[PDB]
Design a binder for this molecule. Sequence first.
Ligand SMILES: CCc1cnn2c(NCc3cnc(N)nc3)cc(-c3c(F)cccc3F)nc12
Length: 279
Amino acid sequence: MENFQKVEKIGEGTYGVVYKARNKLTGEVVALKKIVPSTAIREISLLKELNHPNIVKLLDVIHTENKLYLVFEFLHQDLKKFMDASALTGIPLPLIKSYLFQLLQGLAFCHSHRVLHRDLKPQNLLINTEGAIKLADFGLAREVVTLWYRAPEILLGCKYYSTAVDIWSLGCIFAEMVTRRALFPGDSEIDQLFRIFRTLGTPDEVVWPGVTSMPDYKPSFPKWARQDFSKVVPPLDEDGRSLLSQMLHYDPNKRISAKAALAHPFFQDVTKPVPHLRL
Ligand SMILES: CCc1cnn2c(NCc3cnc(N)nc3)cc(-c3c(F)cccc3F)nc12
């Protein structure tokens, strides 16, 4: 740690404070996360090899005094702040599309290595001036923690959920970029589930075989009808609405994979615009 100079506290991650810091030697500017069971150590050390342009680079892992510091590449802004900043006019579709495409590439990569994020949210999607967007805190899962982006199988008590949970989260984030409002802003586990049900309809054995057998499923759940996506994410075009609908399929087995999503017609005209960032 004596190797780093703390510049400022950039936020409170799930495990500790995240700082912007400077390597007292190389002058390198980095993000320093202060998080030790040996299981964690080997899992985190594994992340050092999970390198991709759309995954925030983990530079080094430092274990000292029974303390754990993660040294990451630094990015100046996150999607939450950017969305807040683009509130009045909304993020341009071409930029939304580029961000979604890059994030799907990042997930396709992690998923191909059987690594799940598990907790995607605007706060951990980091952006730069070059128009890039990156997944942060990847694999760290394996203040109130937000449930807004939680997949229904997690809420229903599925213990062995899949890569599909990240697809669900990204779909929620995609909708939020488009409409400028959170899709399912639940403030409790039941409120989150019920918000999902009210929009996508209460799931049953027809749309999701095996759902009624999930640990936290209750036959007493109210039965709401499904809403049209045309009402949910106007004025997203049919290609975007088709893609969104697949990313939000109830049955995780039917939910589109990151790889298949990258082939969707929505991305036929994808480009990489530069966002206007004010640092
Ligand atoms: C450690 C890798 C990491 C590298 N940059 N960065 C950022 N950067 C964006 C940023 C920069 N300055 C300010 N002031 N605010 C945001 C945020 C978080 C992060 C966090 F700080 C809290 C929760 C989740 C996160 F991803 N983690 C990181």
